[PDB]
Amino acid sequence: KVRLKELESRLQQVDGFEKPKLLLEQYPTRPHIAACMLYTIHNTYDDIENKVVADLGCGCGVLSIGTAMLGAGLCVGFDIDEDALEIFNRNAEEFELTNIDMVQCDVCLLSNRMSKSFDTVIMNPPFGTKNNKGTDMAFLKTALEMARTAVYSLHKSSTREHVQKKAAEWKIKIDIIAELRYDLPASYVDIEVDLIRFSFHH
Amino acid sequence: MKLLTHNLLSSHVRGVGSRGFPLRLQATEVRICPVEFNPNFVARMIPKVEWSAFLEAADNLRLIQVPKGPVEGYEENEEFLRTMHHLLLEVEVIEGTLQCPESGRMFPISRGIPNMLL
Ligand SMILES: C[S@@+](CC[C@H](N)C(=O)[O-])C[C@H]1O[C@@H](n2cnc3c(N)ncnc32)[C@H](O)[C@@H]1O
Numbered sequence: 140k141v142r143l144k145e146l147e148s149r150l151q152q153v154d155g156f157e158k159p160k161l162l163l164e165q166y167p168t169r170p171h172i173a174a175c176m177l178y179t180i181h182n183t184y185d186d187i188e189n190k191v192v193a194d195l196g197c198g199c200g201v202l203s204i205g206t207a208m209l210g211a212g213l214c215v216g217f218d219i220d221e222d223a224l225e226i227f228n229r230n231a232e233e234f235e236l237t238n239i240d241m242v243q244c245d246v247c248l249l250s251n252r253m254s255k256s257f258d259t260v261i262m263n264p265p266f267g268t269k270n271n272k273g274t275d276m277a278f279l280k281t282a283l284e285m286a287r288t289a290v291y292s293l294h295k296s297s298t299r300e301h302v303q304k305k306a307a308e309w310k311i312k313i314d315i316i317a318e319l320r321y322d323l324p325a326s327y328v329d330i331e332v333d334l335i336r337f338s339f340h341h
Numbered sequence: 342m343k344l345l346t347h348n349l350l351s352s353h354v355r356g357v358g359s360r361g362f363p364l365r366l367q368a369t370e371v372r373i374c375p376v377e378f379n380p381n382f383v384a385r386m387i388p389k390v391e392w393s394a395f396l397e398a399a400d401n402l403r404l405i406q407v408p409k410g411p412v413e414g415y416e417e418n419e420e421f422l423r424t425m426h427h428l429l430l431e432v433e434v435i436e437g438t439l440q441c442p443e444s445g446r447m448f449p450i451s452r453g454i455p456n457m458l459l
Pocket residue numbers: 163164165166167168195196197198199200201202217218219220223244245246247262263264265
Protein backbone atom coordinates (compact mmCIF):
# COMPACT_ATOMS: atom_id res chain seq x y z
CA LYS A 140 0.00 0.00 0.00
CA VAL A 141 1.35 3.41 -1.04
CA ARG A 142 0.33 5.99 1.54
CA LEU A 143 -0.89 9.41 0.44
CA LYS A 144 2.08 11.38 1.83
CA GLU A 145 4.55 8.98 0.23
CA LEU A 146 2.78 9.28 -3.11
CA GLU A 147 2.81 13.07 -2.94
CA SER A 148 6.48 13.11 -1.90
CA ARG A 149 7.39 11.00 -4.92
CA LEU A 150 5.37 13.24 -7.24
CA GLN A 151 7.24 16.32 -5.95
CA GLN A 152 10.26 14.81 -7.72
CA VAL A 153 8.66 14.74 -11.18
CA ASP A 154 10.47 17.30 -13.33
CA GLY A 155 8.32 19.92 -15.04
CA PHE A 156 8.52 21.82 -18.29
CA GLU A 157 11.82 23.30 -19.35
CA LYS A 158 10.12 25.82 -21.68
CA PRO A 159 6.35 25.79 -21.15
CA LYS A 160 4.33 26.64 -24.25
CA LEU A 161 1.79 29.23 -23.16
CA LEU A 162 -0.59 28.56 -26.07
CA LEU A 163 -0.86 24.90 -25.04
CA GLU A 164 -1.48 25.79 -21.37
CA GLN A 165 1.58 23.83 -20.24
CA TYR A 166 2.10 23.54 -16.49
CA PRO A 167 2.55 20.38 -14.41
CA THR A 168 -0.31 19.08 -12.30
CA ARG A 169 0.52 20.24 -8.78
CA PRO A 170 1.71 17.31 -6.62
CA HIS A 171 -0.91 17.85 -3.90
CA ILE A 172 -3.65 17.78 -6.55
CA ALA A 173 -2.21 14.78 -8.38
CA ALA A 174 -1.69 12.77 -5.18
CA CYS A 175 -5.19 13.35 -3.80
CA MET A 176 -6.77 12.67 -7.21
CA LEU A 177 -4.84 9.44 -7.85
CA TYR A 178 -5.14 8.21 -4.26
CA THR A 179 -8.93 8.59 -4.49
CA ILE A 180 -9.16 6.91 -7.92
CA HIS A 181 -7.22 3.95 -6.54
CA ASN A 182 -8.43 3.58 -2.97
CA THR A 183 -12.07 4.62 -3.31
CA TYR A 184 -12.91 3.47 -6.84
CA ASP A 185 -10.19 0.86 -7.65
CA ASP A 186 -9.89 2.31 -11.16
CA ILE A 187 -6.08 2.09 -11.60
CA GLU A 188 -4.61 -1.20 -10.39
CA ASN A 189 -4.37 -3.82 -13.16
CA LYS A 190 -6.14 -1.40 -15.52
CA VAL A 191 -5.13 0.22 -18.79
CA VAL A 192 -5.28 3.98 -18.25
CA ALA A 193 -5.04 6.96 -20.62
CA ASP A 194 -3.72 10.35 -19.48
CA LEU A 195 -4.94 12.99 -21.96
CA GLY A 196 -2.70 16.04 -22.17
CA CYS A 197 -0.13 14.13 -20.15
CA GLY A 198 2.49 16.89 -20.28
CA CYS A 199 5.62 16.18 -18.23
CA GLY A 200 3.78 13.14 -16.84
CA VAL A 201 2.83 13.84 -13.18
CA LEU A 202 -0.52 12.03 -13.37
CA SER A 203 0.90 9.17 -15.47
CA ILE A 204 3.91 8.66 -13.20
CA GLY A 205 1.57 8.41 -10.21
CA THR A 206 -0.80 6.05 -12.02
CA ALA A 207 2.09 3.74 -12.92
CA MET A 208 3.27 3.72 -9.31
CA LEU A 209 -0.20 2.64 -8.15
CA GLY A 210 -0.04 -0.55 -10.23
CA ALA A 211 -1.62 0.22 -13.60
CA GLY A 212 -1.17 -2.57 -16.09
CA LEU A 213 -0.23 0.15 -18.59
CA CYS A 214 -0.62 3.93 -18.54
CA VAL A 215 -0.47 5.63 -21.94
CA GLY A 216 0.05 9.39 -22.02
CA PHE A 217 -1.14 11.49 -24.95
CA ASP A 218 0.15 14.98 -25.72
CA ILE A 219 0.37 17.25 -28.75
CA ASP A 220 3.88 18.56 -27.88
CA GLU A 221 7.02 16.51 -28.55
CA ASP A 222 8.96 18.62 -26.02
CA ALA A 223 6.60 17.62 -23.20
CA LEU A 224 6.82 13.94 -24.11
CA GLU A 225 10.63 14.07 -24.07
CA ILE A 226 10.44 15.28 -20.47
CA PHE A 227 7.79 12.67 -19.63
CA ASN A 228 10.01 9.94 -21.04
CA ARG A 229 12.97 11.12 -18.96
CA ASN A 230 10.79 11.17 -15.82
CA ALA A 231 9.60 7.62 -16.50
CA GLU A 232 13.23 6.48 -16.82
CA GLU A 233 14.35 8.25 -13.63
CA PHE A 234 11.50 6.57 -11.73
CA GLU A 235 12.31 3.19 -13.36
CA LEU A 236 8.68 2.83 -14.43
CA THR A 237 8.22 0.39 -17.30
CA ASN A 238 4.40 0.20 -17.38
CA ILE A 239 4.21 3.49 -19.35
CA ASP A 240 3.88 4.41 -23.04
CA MET A 241 3.22 7.70 -24.77
CA VAL A 242 1.80 8.99 -28.04
CA GLN A 243 2.05 12.38 -29.76
CA CYS A 244 -1.33 13.47 -31.11
CA ASP A 245 -4.06 16.12 -31.05
CA VAL A 246 -6.59 14.69 -28.57
CA CYS A 247 -9.39 16.57 -30.33
CA LEU A 248 -8.64 14.71 -33.63
CA LEU A 249 -8.32 11.02 -32.67
CA SER A 250 -9.85 8.39 -34.95
CA ASN A 251 -12.54 5.94 -33.86
CA ARG A 252 -9.78 3.36 -33.33
CA MET A 253 -9.56 4.85 -29.84
CA SER A 254 -13.20 3.98 -29.02
CA LYS A 255 -13.56 2.12 -25.69
CA SER A 256 -9.84 1.34 -25.74
CA PHE A 257 -9.09 2.12 -22.07
CA ASP A 258 -10.56 1.20 -18.72
CA THR A 259 -10.00 4.64 -17.20
CA VAL A 260 -9.09 8.06 -18.56
CA ILE A 261 -7.54 10.75 -16.35
CA MET A 262 -6.69 14.32 -17.31
CA ASN A 263 -5.87 17.89 -16.30
CA PRO A 264 -7.05 19.44 -19.59
CA PRO A 265 -6.46 22.94 -20.93
CA PHE A 266 -9.31 25.46 -20.66
CA GLY A 267 -8.87 27.86 -23.60
CA THR A 268 -11.61 28.36 -26.17
CA LYS A 269 -11.34 26.37 -29.41
CA ASN A 270 -13.98 26.58 -32.16
CA ASN A 271 -16.51 28.15 -29.74
CA LYS A 272 -15.99 25.46 -27.05
CA GLY A 273 -13.80 25.16 -23.98
CA THR A 274 -10.93 22.80 -24.84
CA ASP A 275 -11.64 20.82 -21.64
CA MET A 276 -15.11 19.95 -22.95
CA ALA A 277 -13.59 18.68 -26.21
CA PHE A 278 -11.16 16.58 -24.15
CA LEU A 279 -14.10 15.32 -22.09
CA LYS A 280 -16.08 14.13 -25.12
CA THR A 281 -12.97 12.31 -26.40
CA ALA A 282 -12.27 10.80 -22.97
CA LEU A 283 -15.82 9.48 -22.61
CA GLU A 284 -15.54 7.81 -26.01
CA MET A 285 -12.19 6.23 -25.07
CA ALA A 286 -13.12 5.07 -21.54
CA ARG A 287 -14.99 1.85 -20.82
CA THR A 288 -15.57 2.48 -17.11
CA ALA A 289 -14.63 5.92 -15.79
CA VAL A 290 -13.22 9.35 -16.63
CA TYR A 291 -11.60 11.57 -13.98
CA SER A 292 -11.05 15.20 -14.91
CA LEU A 293 -10.49 18.68 -13.52
CA HIS A 294 -12.88 21.43 -14.65
CA LYS A 295 -13.33 25.01 -13.47
CA SER A 296 -15.86 25.16 -10.66
CA SER A 297 -17.29 28.25 -12.35
CA THR A 298 -18.28 25.99 -15.28
CA ARG A 299 -19.93 23.29 -13.16
CA GLU A 300 -23.48 23.98 -14.38
CA HIS A 301 -22.36 23.58 -17.99
CA VAL A 302 -20.54 20.31 -17.32
CA GLN A 303 -23.63 18.98 -15.53
CA LYS A 304 -25.85 20.00 -18.44
CA LYS A 305 -23.65 18.27 -21.02
CA ALA A 306 -23.46 15.12 -18.87
CA ALA A 307 -27.27 15.06 -18.75
CA GLU A 308 -27.51 15.51 -22.52
CA TRP A 309 -24.94 12.74 -23.09
CA LYS A 310 -26.74 10.45 -20.58
CA ILE A 311 -23.49 10.08 -18.60
CA LYS A 312 -23.29 9.80 -14.83
CA ILE A 313 -21.47 12.64 -13.07
CA ASP A 314 -20.20 13.03 -9.51
CA ILE A 315 -18.29 16.01 -8.14
CA ILE A 316 -15.87 14.33 -5.77
CA ALA A 317 -13.72 17.27 -4.61
CA GLU A 318 -13.36 21.04 -4.77
CA LEU A 319 -9.70 21.92 -5.21
CA ARG A 320 -7.51 24.90 -5.97
CA TYR A 321 -3.98 25.43 -7.20
CA ASP A 322 -1.87 28.30 -8.42
CA LEU A 323 -0.97 28.87 -12.04
CA PRO A 324 2.57 29.73 -13.13
CA ALA A 325 3.30 33.30 -12.07
CA SER A 326 3.28 34.50 -15.70
CA TYR A 327 -0.46 33.79 -16.06
CA VAL A 328 -3.54 33.55 -9.62
CA ASP A 329 -5.68 30.89 -7.94
CA ILE A 330 -7.85 28.53 -9.96
CA GLU A 331 -10.82 26.74 -8.41
CA VAL A 332 -11.48 23.38 -10.07
CA ASP A 333 -13.79 20.47 -9.44
CA LEU A 334 -12.44 16.94 -9.51
CA ILE A 335 -15.20 15.08 -11.34
CA ARG A 336 -15.84 11.36 -11.88
CA PHE A 337 -17.81 10.49 -15.01
CA SER A 338 -19.22 7.00 -15.44
CA PHE A 339 -21.75 5.06 -17.50
CA HIS A 340 -25.20 3.57 -17.06
CA HIS A 341 -25.30 -0.23 -17.25
CA MET B 342 5.88 1.69 -28.47
CA LYS B 343 4.75 -1.63 -27.00
CA LEU B 344 2.60 -4.02 -29.02
CA LEU B 345 -0.34 -3.63 -26.61
CA THR B 346 -0.19 0.10 -27.39
CA HIS B 347 0.02 -0.63 -31.12
CA ASN B 348 -3.05 -2.83 -30.69
CA LEU B 349 -5.00 -0.12 -28.84
CA LEU B 350 -4.06 2.49 -31.43
CA SER B 351 -4.95 0.10 -34.27
CA SER B 352 -8.03 -1.86 -33.29
CA HIS B 353 -11.72 -1.18 -33.88
CA VAL B 354 -14.77 -2.39 -32.00
CA ARG B 355 -16.23 -5.08 -34.27
CA GLY B 356 -19.97 -4.70 -34.79
CA VAL B 357 -22.59 -4.49 -37.50
CA GLY B 358 -20.62 -1.99 -39.59
CA SER B 359 -17.83 -2.67 -42.03
CA ARG B 360 -14.38 -3.90 -41.04
CA GLY B 361 -11.82 -1.42 -39.76
CA PHE B 362 -8.11 -1.80 -40.41
CA PRO B 363 -5.01 -1.45 -38.22
CA LEU B 364 -1.95 0.73 -38.55
CA ARG B 365 0.76 -1.21 -40.36
CA LEU B 366 4.01 -1.31 -38.38
CA GLN B 367 7.42 -1.19 -40.05
CA ALA B 368 10.19 -1.06 -37.42
CA THR B 369 13.85 -0.17 -37.89
CA GLU B 370 15.00 -0.28 -34.26
CA VAL B 371 13.61 -2.26 -31.32
CA ARG B 372 14.57 -2.76 -27.70
CA ILE B 373 13.60 -5.20 -24.97
CA CYS B 374 12.33 -3.73 -21.68
CA PRO B 375 11.54 -5.90 -18.67
CA VAL B 376 8.10 -5.11 -17.31
CA GLU B 377 6.92 -6.53 -14.01
CA PHE B 378 4.77 -9.54 -14.82
CA ASN B 379 1.13 -8.86 -13.88
CA PRO B 380 -0.69 -12.10 -14.80
CA ASN B 381 -4.13 -10.83 -13.75
CA PHE B 382 -3.61 -7.87 -16.09
CA VAL B 383 -2.42 -10.00 -19.00
CA ALA B 384 -5.40 -12.33 -18.56
CA ARG B 385 -7.93 -9.54 -18.80
CA MET B 386 -6.17 -8.11 -21.87
CA ILE B 387 -6.35 -11.40 -23.84
CA PRO B 388 -10.02 -11.05 -24.98
CA LYS B 389 -9.37 -7.41 -25.93
CA VAL B 390 -6.47 -8.07 -28.31
CA GLU B 391 -7.23 -7.72 -32.02
CA TRP B 392 -5.28 -10.82 -32.99
CA SER B 393 -4.82 -10.13 -36.70
CA ALA B 394 -3.19 -6.76 -35.97
CA PHE B 395 -1.05 -8.29 -33.22
CA LEU B 396 0.19 -11.09 -35.49
CA GLU B 397 0.96 -8.69 -38.36
CA ALA B 398 3.00 -6.41 -36.11
CA ALA B 399 4.74 -9.36 -34.47
CA ASP B 400 5.67 -10.70 -37.92
CA ASN B 401 7.22 -7.37 -38.92
CA LEU B 402 9.32 -7.45 -35.75
CA ARG B 403 10.55 -10.96 -36.61
CA LEU B 404 9.07 -12.43 -33.42
CA ILE B 405 8.76 -16.21 -33.51
CA GLN B 406 6.48 -18.97 -32.24
CA VAL B 407 3.82 -16.32 -31.60
CA PRO B 408 0.54 -17.77 -30.23
CA LYS B 409 -2.07 -17.54 -32.97
CA GLY B 410 -4.94 -16.97 -30.52
CA PRO B 411 -6.10 -17.65 -26.95
CA VAL B 412 -5.41 -21.18 -25.71
CA GLU B 413 -7.78 -23.33 -23.66
CA GLY B 414 -8.04 -22.23 -20.03
CA TYR B 415 -5.50 -19.49 -20.64
CA GLU B 416 -6.37 -17.74 -17.36
CA GLU B 417 -4.65 -20.67 -15.62
CA ASN B 418 -1.86 -21.13 -18.20
CA GLU B 419 1.12 -19.30 -16.71
CA GLU B 420 3.33 -20.09 -19.71
CA PHE B 421 0.83 -18.58 -22.16
CA LEU B 422 0.35 -15.50 -19.98
CA ARG B 423 4.12 -15.05 -19.57
CA THR B 424 4.66 -15.33 -23.32
CA MET B 425 1.90 -12.83 -24.08
CA HIS B 426 3.25 -10.50 -21.38
CA HIS B 427 6.60 -10.44 -23.14
CA LEU B 428 5.17 -9.99 -26.64
CA LEU B 429 2.60 -7.32 -25.65
CA LEU B 430 4.58 -5.30 -23.10
CA GLU B 431 8.33 -6.02 -23.33
CA VAL B 432 9.13 -5.64 -27.06
CA GLU B 433 9.32 -1.90 -27.71
CA VAL B 434 9.53 -0.27 -31.13
CA ILE B 435 11.96 2.65 -30.86
CA GLU B 436 12.24 3.76 -34.50
CA GLY B 437 9.81 2.92 -37.27
CA THR B 438 6.64 3.93 -39.04
CA LEU B 439 2.90 3.35 -38.75
CA GLN B 440 1.06 3.35 -42.08
CA CYS B 441 -2.48 4.69 -42.15
CA PRO B 442 -4.68 2.33 -44.22
CA GLU B 443 -7.12 5.07 -45.35
CA SER B 444 -4.35 7.37 -46.55
CA GLY B 445 -1.13 5.47 -47.12
CA ARG B 446 0.67 8.14 -45.10
CA MET B 447 3.50 7.11 -42.80
CA PHE B 448 3.55 8.32 -39.24
CA PRO B 449 7.00 8.21 -37.60
CA ILE B 450 7.86 6.38 -34.41
CA SER B 451 10.90 8.06 -32.89
CA ARG B 452 12.49 7.43 -29.48
CA GLY B 453 9.65 4.99 -28.94
CA ILE B 454 6.91 7.61 -29.45
CA PRO B 455 4.47 7.42 -32.39
CA ASN B 456 3.80 10.91 -33.76
CA MET B 457 0.23 10.81 -35.12
CA LEU B 458 0.09 14.60 -35.52
CA LEU B 459 -0.57 15.92 -39.01
C1 LIG C 1 -2.25 21.63 -17.80
S1 LIG C 1 -1.10 20.73 -18.87
C2 LIG C 1 -1.45 19.07 -18.22
C3 LIG C 1 -0.59 18.76 -17.01
C4 LIG C 1 -0.04 17.35 -17.00
N1 LIG C 1 -0.96 16.47 -16.27
C5 LIG C 1 1.36 17.40 -16.43
O1 LIG C 1 1.57 16.93 -15.31
O2 LIG C 1 2.29 17.93 -17.06
C6 LIG C 1 -2.06 20.56 -20.39
C7 LIG C 1 -1.37 19.67 -21.43
O3 LIG C 1 -2.21 19.60 -22.57
C8 LIG C 1 -1.40 19.56 -23.74
N2 LIG C 1 -2.29 19.88 -24.87
C9 LIG C 1 -2.85 21.09 -25.21
N3 LIG C 1 -3.65 20.92 -26.28
C10 LIG C 1 -3.62 19.60 -26.62
C11 LIG C 1 -4.23 18.86 -27.63
N4 LIG C 1 -5.07 19.43 -28.51
N5 LIG C 1 -3.99 17.51 -27.71
C12 LIG C 1 -3.14 16.90 -26.81
N6 LIG C 1 -2.54 17.62 -25.82
C13 LIG C 1 -2.77 18.95 -25.74
C14 LIG C 1 -0.28 20.52 -23.44
O4 LIG C 1 0.81 20.27 -24.32
C15 LIG C 1 -0.05 20.26 -21.95
O5 LIG C 1 0.99 19.33 -21.73
